[PDB]
Ligand binder design. Structure first.
Ligand SMILES: Nc1nc2c(ncn2[C@@H]2O[C@H](COP(=O)(O)OP(=O)(O)O)[C@@H](O)[C@H]2O)c(=O)[nH]1
Ligand SMILES: [Mg+2]
Ligand SMILES: [Zn+2]
Lengths: 200, 38
């Protein structure tokens, strides 16, 4: 059997939400537009060692600010990704606002925080400065949508939390759009270590 | 082992063909997008 989860993707306009979700090619070709809510729902299939899992990712069509999404957006949300731009400190300042707006309607759902555009070397929100929490239902990852860097990480963590299986794995990567930029390997190694020590 | 029907559709529920949200049997329109039940 295949399981299905509604995933709300929220964050300030211009942080890369649409660019990120569109990396999953099949989810883009099968996306569904919801006219009454101004949303594109991308059905993202991931193939795990226990079967297929589908994340129905809700990506807004507009530039809504926190608290500006129609109420139907959050209805029956079972997980979420909050995205910001590591080159724009204001988009990270608004992460607690999106988190507050989300938890007001959905309460306790697993949430992943994603700092996008880490391919840009002039990073303003540094890994060391990422505010980390004691919450078991919150996790952070660096991502670069245009390089597919860490694309699968948020979905794998959410899948493990939703299924309750810490050893869940993806047996194959989904078909992704070819990278448009290069993620510097030295930066990736340094960022990954900086986040390890900060989380612990 | 599979997912063991942990998240299977309950009796009478239906998935909205417009936005894929899962609805109850008595709902005549989707609780999220308000589109009438297929
Ligand atoms: N260097 C780099 N630029 C990105 C990345 N993701 C998005 N951009 C750009 O950020 C701008 C807004 O992207 P968009 O997906 O529309 O953001 P949204 O408003 O949150 O949906 C665009 O010019 C993107 O090309 C990334 O991962 N790396
Ligand atoms: Mg967008
Ligand atoms: Zn619907």
């Amino acid at each position: 059997p295949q399981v299905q989860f509604k995933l709300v993707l929220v964050g300030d306009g211009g942080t890369g939400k649409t660019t990120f979700v569109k990396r999953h090619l099949t989810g883009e070709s099968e996306k569904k537009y919801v006219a009454t809510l101004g949303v594109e729902v991308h059905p993202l299939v991931f193939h795990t060692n226990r079967g297929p899992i589908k994340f129905n990712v809700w990506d807004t069509a507009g530039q809504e600010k926190f608290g500006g999404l129609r109420d139907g957006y959050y209805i029956q949300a079972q997980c979420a990704i909050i995205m910001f731009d590591v080159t724009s400190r204001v988009t990270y300042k608004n992460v607690p606002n999106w988190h507050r707006d989300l938890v007001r309607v959905c309460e306790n759902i697993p949430i992943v925080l994603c700092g996008n555009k880490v391919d840009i070397k002039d990073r303003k929100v540094k890994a060391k400065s990422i505010v980390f929490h004691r919450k078991k239902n919150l996790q952070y990852y660096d991502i670069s949508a245009k390089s597919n860097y860490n694309f699968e990480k948020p979905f794998l963590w959410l899948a493990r939390k939703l299924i309750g299986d810490p050893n869940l794995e993806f047996v194959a990567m989904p078909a992704l759009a070819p990278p448009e930029v290069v993620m510097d390997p030295a930066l990736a190694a340094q960022y990954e270590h900086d986040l390890e020590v900060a989380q612990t | 082992m599979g997912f063991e029907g942990m998240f299977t559709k309950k009796e009478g529920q239906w998935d909205c063909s417009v936005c894929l949200v899962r609805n109850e049997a008595s709902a005549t329109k989707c609780i999220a997008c308000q589109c009438p039940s297929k």
